[PDB]
């Protein structure tokens, strides 16, 4: 059929217009947005806490500086390094070399399927295990805090400050699973999928968000600091979107022609 | 008294896919009004339904093929209808059917010339259910479902290709060809030679388009391929 | 709505099971229109 | 019979925020009527909408400023408005705020002058939204948003920092010096000089206040620093 | 507040055939009309009530009985009634049968004359119940239930064995001969030599068919034999 | 209907319990006839 398409708008049409045919029957709508993202999914995998905790420092940070590295993980499907927010995603070709490797997370199918440009919803999140008959707690603090860190000595045994606090802290018997939801509690009204402005007034790195996420998670083992064992310990961690919202159309990845 | 109960078999389990919710943690919360933003998207089928550009060789990749000079009864441009093909890679249509595992509809597709206006001639546009072996020259492509497309005036001209389907709904993906993956072929043939005044440029070019029809639907969403990555 | 199979039975209040925005004192419609 | 159930994967977990209550063990106890005590406290707001009083270096602390005699084109005072900012550290605004994450709402100020009865002058107060750099100049704060407040019979005079924000509630400590975190700054002008009578003290002194607004807000709390202790 | 109850013993326990379902995982999924298929099986009796050809042995197997010329007074053939028994085992009646454990109702047996049309004769069919021997000549047969069947123009003829049993249902395999397994015997008589005309074939031949009753009813399934894949 | 022995309580809705077939816009009966 005759028509324009300089104009953008293009009626989309049926078998019928040119030829002989008819419509077929809608069928089912599994496309909805709100039920399309709801279903869990790996985000990041993050060792367990023995004792008081160093929050790594800001990134121009030099050599020689002590801390602790890979035990913090951020909620958000965005690009992250080393528990801080990033830009760009990482990957090391090379484990080889003097330095520190920093730990990268994404969310490969919510950029896999993120065709809009902003984004609100609930989260729910569930931790697990990946050793044998382990003992372990979950600990969270909202977005735009900081952990304290800090031990209390009680019968001269040290006991970190981060079993205690009026923030959600959750515990499992042997073999348990952790789950609770959260609610969206940025400053922001919506989370940017992808952003083209800057937080500072100046000296900021363009694109940069600053409180695009729902918090932060760690886990610990609940002992005293006299008893650090010998052999580093894992878990995953879940996150299912919940009640989601878009607001305007973008583009999709670039899938590469061989 | 104690309300006696036996739990089933299935306790403790985590299924990443129950369709239920669960216990609250930091609830009481109010959140900013978003009234303000426009443009709701509601269903990915509104983006599935905007056009968007193909891609072909030009041997590395363009969106236009160039109408040569020379005379061959071949087909002037020819891929197959397979969602999984190449040339619908990166059109809205595939890489979003990319993430499901069925499908229903009409499929659309768009033209339009860009030539000088001084320009004029005939195309035709034929589209071939599957067969032994795909058509080779234009007697045979009259007979298939075909029309006639003519420059003028107006730049575009849209064509439809119907379901014809030997069952309800349809694999996305070719692992293999059976007769509920690929569906035949569709394919351009030039009807009549370009004419052209003196001091012009030679051999124009025309533009493709891809997009959802009015009927299509998806279903039965599976995971994604994160190869795009590296 | 959503990918929610209860339709019977809720026990937590709506203000404590989702997050809620505070006031202030069918087919698909298209995107994009011309004149 | 048994009521068939299966126990989901969040069981036998312990999570202190949980919002219900557990099984009892001792009730049936009755206990003393308190309709005697009079001021029940319902919400914390009702404290934090107290004046108190601030603090700045006398260089080793003091709440009020001492007016000089020289002359200068400098602010006589000037503190950055950021809830966790020492000057507002010992306030009830600032030690309430500091258990919590966001806030909402105007910040009020006020002043009282202490000075003799026979004293004489004016004094210019401004609010400068966030810039590159913090004013330094009479001509450049008469531009933002400013008063003028004259010593007369009355004593006091309130000021109120206008809620101007890019964005719905705001971050109560500032880590790095986001948008979100800090909003300006405040400063206190000497427009003209004091005038006094032979055979008076020099130098009177000025005091300052701080409490919560009308439509102040918080929200989110959030565990709290021990380090007091020490 | 939590309410309080005990699981009984049996928890955690997986059985086979509990009467209930269990929890969904990708639920909302709409499937394709079946409304075009016709013939819609909803009980297997339907299937049980056709009657099927069995077998006898020719010393290796054949469905029909060849009538001899020799005059002899014992049964031209005999077989038990128990569904177990070879010459049911491949009858649809038998092969459903022994996927259960009891049955009711009549069974029921037919027979067609596949000879020249001009030949005659007459036959008789007896059902004896359980006795100590069973029965070996005509002055016997004719005492116990039977009929006359003669050849004319209609070429077949049904003949149907009575229930007639010491307790309701009756065991469908016989591990041991107890009444409540076997039920007698069924033979056939030649009542009168077959006339033929000069220059016809000699020895015609008798087919059977068996099916279920009216009133045929099973009960009780019980798992199945997989012998048959060797 | 089957070897289903609840008939008092459903926790899931149909369309999540159950497939349907989208729509589209006693004594047993006998098979084969003669006429």
Redesign the interface.
Same mark, same amino acid.
């Given at each position: 059929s005759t028509d324009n398409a300089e104009t953008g708008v293009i009626e989309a049409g049926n078998t019928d217009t040119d030829f002989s045919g008819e419509l077929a029957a809608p069928g089912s709508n599994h496309t909805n947005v709100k039920f399309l993202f709801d279903r869990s999914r790996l985000l990041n995998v993050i060792k367990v806490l023995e004792k008081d905790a160093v929050f790594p420092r800001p990134f121009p940070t030099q050599e020689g500086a002590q801390q602790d590295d890979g035990y913090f993980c951020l909620l958000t499907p965005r690009p992250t390094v080393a528990s801080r927010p990033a830009t760009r995603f990482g990957l090391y070709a090379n484990p080889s070399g003097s330095g520190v490797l920093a730990n990268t997370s994404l969310d490969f199918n919510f950029y896999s399927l993120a065709c809009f440009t902003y984004f609100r919803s609930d989260l729910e999140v569930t931790v697990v295990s990946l050793e044998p008959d382990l003992e372990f707690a979950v600990g969270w603090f909202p977005s735009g805090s900081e952990y304290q860190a800090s031990s209390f000595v009680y019968d001269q045994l040290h006991v970190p400050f981060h079993f205690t606090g009026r923030t959600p802290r959750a515990f499992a018997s042997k073999g348990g699973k952790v789950s609770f939801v959260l609610p969206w509690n940025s400053v922001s009204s919506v989370l940017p999928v992808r952003w083209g402005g800057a937080s500072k007034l100046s000296s900021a790195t363009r694109g940069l968000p600053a409180h695009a996420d729902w918090g932060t998670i760690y886990a610990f083992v609940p002992r005293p600091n006299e008893k650090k064992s010998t052999a580093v310990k894992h878990v995953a961690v879940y996150i299912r979107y919940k009640n989601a919202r878009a607001w305007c159309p973008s583009m999709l990845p670039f899938r590469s022609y061989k | 008294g104690?309300?006696?109960? #036996?739990?089933?078999?299935?306790?403790?389990?985590?299924?990443?896919?129950?369709?239920?919710?669960?216990? !609250?943690? +930091?609830?009481?919360?109010?959140?900013?009004?978003?009234n303000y933003?426009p443009? /709701?998207?509601?269903?990915?089928?509104?983006?599935?339904?905007?056009?968007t550009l193909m #891609?072909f060789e030009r041997v590395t $990749?363009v969106p236009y093929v160039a109408v040569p000079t020379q005379f061959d009864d071949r087909p002037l441009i020819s891929f197959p209808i397979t969602l999984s093909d190449?040339v619908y890679?990166?059109t809205?249509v595939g #890489?979003?059917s990319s993430?499901?595992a069925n499908y229903?509809?009409?499929i659309?597709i @768009?033209l339009?010339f860009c030539g000088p206006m001084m320009a004029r001639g005939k195309f035709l546009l034929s589209y071939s259910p599957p067969n032994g072996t795909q058509p080779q020259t234009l007697s045979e492509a009259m007979q298939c479902?075909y029309?006639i497309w003519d420059i003028?005036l107006?730049?575009?001209?849209?064509f439809?290709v119907? +379901?014809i389907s030997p069952?309800? +709904?349809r694999e996305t993906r070719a692992i293999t060809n059976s007769v509920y993956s690929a569906d035949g072929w569709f394919s351009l043939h030039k009807l009549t030679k370009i004419t052209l005044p003196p001091d012009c440029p030679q051999s124009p070019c025309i533009l493709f388009?891809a997009? #959802?029809? /009015?009927?299509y @639907?998806?279903?039965? !969403?599976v995971?994604?391929?994160?190869s $795009?990555?590296? | 709505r959503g990918n929610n199979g209860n339709m019977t039975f809720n026990y937590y209040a709506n203000t404590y099971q989702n997050s809620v925005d505070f006031s202030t004192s069918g087919i698909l419609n298209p995107l994009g229109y011309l004149k």
């Amino acid at each position: 059929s005759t028509d324009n398409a300089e104009t953008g708008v293009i009626e989309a049409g049926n078998t019928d217009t040119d030829f002989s045919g008819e419509l077929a029957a809608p069928g089912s709508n599994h496309t909805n947005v709100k039920f399309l993202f709801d279903r869990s999914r790996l985000l990041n995998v993050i060792k367990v806490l023995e004792k008081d905790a160093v929050f790594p420092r800001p990134f121009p940070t030099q050599e020689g500086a002590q801390q602790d590295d890979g035990y913090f993980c951020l909620l958000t499907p965005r690009p992250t390094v080393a528990s801080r927010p990033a830009t760009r995603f990482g990957l090391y070709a090379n484990p080889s070399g003097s330095g520190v490797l920093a730990n990268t997370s994404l969310d490969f199918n919510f950029y896999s399927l993120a065709c809009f440009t902003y984004f609100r919803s609930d989260l729910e999140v569930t931790v697990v295990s990946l050793e044998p008959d382990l003992e372990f707690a979950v600990g969270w603090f909202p977005s735009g805090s900081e952990y304290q860190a800090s031990s209390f000595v009680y019968d001269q045994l040290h006991v970190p400050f981060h079993f205690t606090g009026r923030t959600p802290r959750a515990f499992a018997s042997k073999g348990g699973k952790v789950s609770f939801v959260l609610p969206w509690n940025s400053v922001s009204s919506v989370l940017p999928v992808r952003w083209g402005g800057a937080s500072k007034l100046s000296s900021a790195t363009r694109g940069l968000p600053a409180h695009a996420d729902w918090g932060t998670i760690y886990a610990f083992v609940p002992r005293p600091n006299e008893k650090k064992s010998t052999a580093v310990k894992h878990v995953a961690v879940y996150i299912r979107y919940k009640n989601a919202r878009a607001w305007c159309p973008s583009m999709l990845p670039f899938r590469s022609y061989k | 008294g104690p309300i006696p109960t #036996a739990p089933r078999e299935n306790s403790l389990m985590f299924l990443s896919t129950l369709p239920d919710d669960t216990v !609250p943690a +930091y609830g009481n919360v109010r959140t900013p009004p978003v009234n303000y933003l426009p443009g /709701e998207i509601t269903d990915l089928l509104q983006l599935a339904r905007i056009p968007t550009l193909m #891609a072909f060789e030009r041997v590395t $990749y363009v969106p236009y093929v160039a109408v040569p000079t020379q005379f061959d009864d071949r087909p002037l441009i020819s891929f197959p209808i397979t969602l999984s093909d190449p040339v619908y890679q990166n059109t809205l249509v595939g #890489a979003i059917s990319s993430n499901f595992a069925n499908y229903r509809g009409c499929i659309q597709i @768009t033209l339009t010339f860009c030539g000088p206006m001084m320009a004029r001639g005939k195309f035709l546009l034929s589209y071939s259910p599957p067969n032994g072996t795909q058509p080779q020259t234009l007697s045979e492509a009259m007979q298939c479902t075909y029309s006639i497309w003519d420059i003028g005036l107006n730049s575009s001209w849209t064509f439809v290709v119907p +379901y014809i389907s030997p069952s309800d +709904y349809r694999e996305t993906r070719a692992i293999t060809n059976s007769v509920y993956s690929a569906d035949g072929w569709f394919s351009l043939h030039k009807l009549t030679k370009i004419t052209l005044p003196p001091d012009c440029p030679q051999s124009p070019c025309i533009l493709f388009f891809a997009s #959802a029809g /009015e009927d299509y @639907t998806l279903r039965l !969403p599976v995971d994604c391929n994160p190869s $795009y990555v590296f | 709505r959503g990918n929610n199979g209860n339709m019977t039975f809720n026990y937590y209040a709506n203000t404590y099971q989702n997050s809620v925005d505070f006031s202030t004192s069918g087919i698909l419609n298209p995107l994009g229109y011309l004149k």
